[PDB]
């Protein structure tokens, strides 16, 4: 019937999500992840309903920057697909492990 060639929907998503400013990860899963991570350090903590939002915003911004650098690395290798080696190289160049 009707089908889009691969890539066109990807370009539509790229032009759409870059224009939007909302959050891309759901709230309850991120809150549960934050709570289980914090459980290791101190037991019986209580996050304010805004600290989890601040952590979500910071993590989303960091991941978006990491993916921008990963896309740069992938395009450097004459490819359009990002691969784990690209993320590893980006994190090695930025100076974190």
């Amino acid at each position: 019937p009707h089908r889009y060639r691969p890539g066109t929907v990807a370009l539509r998503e790229i032009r759409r999500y870059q224009k939007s400013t909302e959050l891309l990860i759901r709230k309850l899963p991120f809150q549960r992840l934050v709570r289980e991570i914090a459980q290791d350090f101190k037991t019986d903590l209580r996050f304010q309903s805004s600290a989890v939002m601040a952590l979500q915003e910071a993590s989303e911004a960091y991941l978006v920057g990491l993916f921008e650098d990963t896309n740069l690395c992938a395009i450097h290798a004459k490819r359009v697909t990002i691969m784990p080696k690209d993320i590893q190289l980006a994190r090695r160049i930025r100076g974190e492990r």
């Binding site: 370009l11 790229i14 870059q18």
Partner: peptide, 18 residues
């Protein structure tokens, strides 16, 4: 500096374009 609820600049790399 991270700006909360600010998004990113709309840009697409040259190689990704058709």
């Amino acid at each position: 500096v991270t700006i909360a609820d600010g998004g990113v600049l709309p840009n697409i790399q040259s190689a990704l374009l058709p």
